[PDB]
């Protein structure tokens, strides 16, 4: 099946693709945003913990990726299959190698 | 055209078996298990096999290897062979009798001897593999020198496989 | 290969639900993406804490004794869990962890692909 599934603070613009099996959970003192033009490639999962999770506009996130803590993806980048962020940020136009783990 | 299971093989009715599949004898075919042969490509499973949870099954639209039974088939999984959790088989490809695969590792247009042992998160890919070798987990065998150079099975890496499925 | 790009690829689901048999005991903030796979044996369980996530293709299987993912743990997609397990309070797994008789401190994180297997406890 198609779906996604999120929880608690999540908005997501509308022109947003978001694969199959995606995970977007904010916690309750926290939240998730997703601007226009992006893709969540199958299986992701994002978990907002102390504060925001920010997609920019166009960013392309790859299949297995994950996302826990607070942290902003800028405008555009792109985040190799299976990335693993870890409160930690991306720059605008940034780029991880697929497999690759920044965490703080 | 449809799957043949044998009455005497024990199929998990939560796996999925798409197409020209032939699924021998005493074989055991877990829940979650993915086998899929949309294409028109022959399968065929050997007796008393074991698919555990996860595992996979796909194969190309070209491309065959000969089975023991002069057919051609996109995959030909021999007897007793052991594919475990999240590993996948593809493509054209050939186990013989007793072959091992671990955890999430991946054979992929090649042909894998009897008696071998592959173990976890690997890749073999465009090689003959001689019977009877064992492949460290981690390892990316692409070239048929790196074959020619695989350990041989140790007594020791058999139980190892042999622990791994317990049943 | 870049690093990760010879392991399988992550497959869809054909669900939009995951499948327990055995022995588990589930929390009611905990999130299982569909097509998981918790498999517990008759000497086993599986337990699973407040606030977990499971990611896509994940398959978390119990061998004597107990697989314990304690609470705010996340697991990304694919993540395999054989044997018994205790992943800590807070940890995160990258996509396509292996763990095999191998347990994690609260708060570790793992990197994707990584593959953790001793023989027995």
């Known amino acids: 099946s198609d779906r996604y599934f999120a929880s608690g603070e999540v908005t997501i613009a509308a022109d947003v693709v978001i694969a199959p099996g995606v995970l977007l959970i904010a916690e309750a003192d926290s939240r998730i945003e997703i601007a226009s033009g992006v893709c969540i490639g199958l299986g992701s999962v994002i978990h907002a913990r102390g504060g925001a999770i920010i997609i920019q506009a166009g960013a392309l996130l790859a299949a297995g990726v994950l996302i826990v803590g607070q942290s902003i993806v800028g405008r555009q980048a792109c985040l190799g299959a299976s990335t693993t962020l870890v409160n930690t940020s991306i720059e605008a136009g940034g780029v991880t190698a697929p497999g690759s783990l920044l965490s703080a | 055209?449809?799957?043949?299971?044998?009455?005497?093989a024990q199929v998990h009715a939560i796996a999925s078996i798409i197409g020209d599949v032939r699924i021998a004898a005493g074989v055991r075919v877990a829940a979650g298990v993915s086998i899929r042969a949309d294409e028109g490509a022959p399968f065929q499973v050997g007796k008393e096999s074991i698919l555990q949870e996860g595992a996979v099954i796909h194969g190309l639209?070209?491309?065959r290897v000969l089975g023991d039974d002069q057919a051609d088939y996109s995959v030909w999984i021999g007897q007793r062979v052991a594919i475990?959790?999240?590993?996948?088989?593809?493509?054209p490809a050939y186990?013989?009798?007793?072959?091992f695969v671990g955890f999430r590792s991946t054979v992929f247009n090649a042909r894998v001897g009897?008696?071998?042992?592959?173990?976890?998160?690997a890749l073999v890919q465009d090689v003959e593999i001689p019977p009877g070798?064992?492949?460290?987990?981690?390892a990316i065998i692409t070239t048929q020198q790196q074959a020619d150079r695989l350990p041989e099975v140790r007594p020791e890496d058999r139980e190892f496989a042999r622990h791994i499925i317990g049943s």
């Open chain 2, 1 to 8: 055209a449809e799957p043949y299971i044998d009455p005497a």
């Open chain 2, 61 to 63: 639209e070209y491309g």
């Open chain 2, 84 to 91: 475990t959790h999240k590993a996948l088989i593809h493509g």
């Open chain 2, 95 to 99: 186990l013989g009798d007793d072959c």
């Open chain 2, 114 to 121: 009897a008696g071998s042992v592959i173990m976890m998160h």
């Open chain 2, 133 to 138: 070798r064992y492949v460290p987990s981690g």
